[PDB]
Ligand binder design. Structure first.
Ligand code: V9Y
Ligand code: V9Y
Ligand code: NA
Ligand code: NA
Ligand code: NI
Ligand code: NI
Ligand code: NI
Ligand code: NI
Ligand code: NI
Ligand code: NI
Ligand code: NI
Ligand code: NI
Lengths: 173, 173, 173, 173, 173, 173
């Protein structure tokens, strides 16, 4: 067993490995959505930028977790990364709703991880989640919610005008 | 015969002269479209800027080819430049669709030129096309396609609002 | 009829369209001459620069006229652009003499246009010609005349030395 | 079918989708190796930096291909990303040899893709591979080969001294 | 066999070694011509500069090829470098004509190398030639052709005045 | 006979031509060694840099001599440049020992040239050797000797560790 390990339960170690896989999956989902808005029959440059940025942020989530794992003494075990549910996201509104759903999923997974960490009385891991992950998910969900509300009040996804204007006036700057 | 000529088939020379004429024709077409959007009963300043820029780019395409011709030892033979098909382009959407069609035309002509160059085992001419022309046409077509898709999703050419907003939010910056 | 049109006779409109075509033709002629001096069996870099610059200046002449047309309420009607008289200009001296002739041609066409403008009592169009075109042609003709005189006093086109030195000492800087 | 598609064979489209998946797989492999050198019982910071950089470069390979796909008119179809062959890479030397093998694999896949592109007479796609991928793989293989040779001449993986010094004197700067 | 070798035919390897030798030979020829214009009974400083620069450029051609060879897995085999055909180049015009001939020779050798590379379906080597060698030879030949034409139209090599003026007005700046 | 010649014995002229050939040969030898350390199965970047620099320095030795020759009134006569003795230099230590031997050879040739120059009472040529060549060879030999001693005291060429560390700690900076 690793010389640095201390107060690191194997249940925690397994949760960390699962969370790593999930963050990588989310990165894959966001990559999918981004290049779906790059298509010549969708053509929403700023939606594409937005989801590409979110993809890279989830990738950094994963890497932060892997470094945490090696720091505590656990061992990283990588699994396959599943293909996203869809290859075609229909609209900007629907991609936003999907992203909101995905982030609520990852949030619940993190909440159960923090619960397991408090239960195995691992306060350092509990605070690592408290600091680097919980509030980022709260912000991400509130932001996606704002986006969904605005796109809806504009008549998306019926009005193609709505998505075109949103792309310019919100996801530009 | 010119002292510099080497491995330059006369079939290639004829193709180059034809491509020169075609690039000049395209420049004329884009000039037409540009000043059609300058009209007081159309009045789309940014459409006008866009097609004027594209006109000058095609002019430089032609000049690059003429310099290539003199470099290989061929001789430039200029022909008349035909008037564009139309004097009135109806709308911004229709001008975009016409431009997309014209660029697919010039692309197919360039592809047949590259084929002829590979067949007469003229690798320098093949790579000149590979480098300075093929990818520029791929980019131009994808861009015009984006423009057509967006203008359509906004309700062009019915909605005059759509073309007015596109002119400002996409062809401005 | 266009909402901006005022005091713009249709005879003037036709003259403007013809002058546009002629300026474009001249641009084509200068393009021809330029790349004739780019040939490996002529090889006069500064002659080439000179006629390329003159080509682009005539192109701007045309565009200025097209904008004038749309400003007055007329409608631009583009015609074919004829191939230059020659594909081979023999020498620097002969190209200069041809250019002088072409500019005297375009000058006479502009003078008849100004006459028509004064006759249809269109003072704005008369002054547009007075300002942006007449004096430029006077300068261009005097300059080409200087060039022809110098090239002749040097023994062009017999002396190839003469054209080589002129290219360096006059068309360089 | 997409409005921009021209001369893009569906066999090419399938090859592109497969190459995208493979570049993503390679990125996953390099991520694995990197965080294997982050372990407290391996502890080779510069090996870790090296393979993390290579991971991000392969990720950009994938994204470049996805943008190419949307540009030509094809449609991106994402598949699962397989877990790397190993979870434990034994040594710096063995990780280098594995990386060399993986890059020879991806190189052969790209070579067969270029062959298919030349056969379906798709010169733009052939040159896209020629430019953005072939030489990068030649460089990567020669570099990994240098690394393997040096690590071997130093007595890796027996001598832990060898890997420690290589980490500092080659992968530092 | 070298660990990096992949898709590198031994016929290609032999062609590369021969091309290395030929580029070195050309460098030797240009060195010869340069210091022939340094002689007190020729005394053409700018001709000398010109051919010395061209000598060093051919030397870099050779070195680029040697690095390519080691990159693909081949092995560099150096041969003797033959003395130039002449020790006395008669005139500036004759040196230029000789240089034009030599560059057409090396161009044909490179063209046959590119043919062999396309035939052994080595696209990376084909593109290495396409990029770093073919167009440089096209430019070099067109430039030498310009020089020969100008020197001839000035009455070289009879007129010593012609070569003296060319040295100053073309090979200076 | 050349108008500038004064006190320049033909025996000296022949010695100069031979020394030119020898400096060029040495440049070829150093080029060989350099790209031998570029091989993926040798891979000593700094050895490669070192011998490439030495190659270019010998090339400048040759050119300095050729300019000296034209200055005194002699005539440069170029001969073939022989291939180096070896195509494979075994190790860094052995390349260093070979280079030391080659520089002692060229030094003895220069010493006999200075002797011939003092004997034909050519003090300018004697001092040209004294200044631009003798001390450079003394420095080069002492430096190569230092290198050989250090590589030996480190256990080269047995210890591959020794050559790897020398490459970094001495030939880097
Ligand atoms: O917050 C707690 N530990 O940190 C906790 C959870 C349940 C209990 C308990 O058993 N109360 O009776 O305590
Ligand atoms: O056999 C052939 N046609 O029937 C053939 C000759 C050369 C090529 C070719 O261009 N390969 O890349 O193909
Ligand atoms: Na290419
Ligand atoms: Na006035
Ligand atoms: Ni996340
Ligand atoms: Ni509690
Ligand atoms: Ni074009
Ligand atoms: Ni004009
Ligand atoms: Ni890759
Ligand atoms: Ni060369
Ligand atoms: Ni082929
Ligand atoms: Ni020397």
């Amino acid at each position: 067993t690793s010389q640095v390990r201390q107060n690191y339960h194997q249940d925690s170690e397994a949760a960390i490995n699962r969370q790593i896989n999930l963050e990588l999956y989310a990165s894959y989902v966001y990559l999918s959505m981004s290049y779906y808005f790059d298509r010549d029959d969708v053509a929403l440059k700023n939606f594409a930028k937005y989801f590409l940025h979110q993809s890279h942020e989830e990738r950094e989530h994963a890497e932060k977790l892997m470094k945490l794992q090696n720091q505590r003494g656990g061992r990283i075990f990588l699994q396959d990364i599943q293909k996203p549910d869809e290859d075609d996201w229909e609209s900007g509104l629907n991609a936003m709703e999907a992203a909101l759903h995905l982030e609520k999923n990852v949030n619940q997974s993190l909440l159960e991880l923090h619960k397991l960490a408090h239960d195995k009385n691992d306060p350092h891991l509990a605070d690592f989640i408290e600091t680097h992950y919980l509030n980022e998910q709260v912000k991400a969900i509130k932001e996606l919610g704002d986006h969904v509300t605005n796109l809806r009040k504009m008549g998306a996804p019926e009005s193609g005008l709505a998505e075109y204007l949103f792309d310019k006036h919100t996801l530009g700057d």
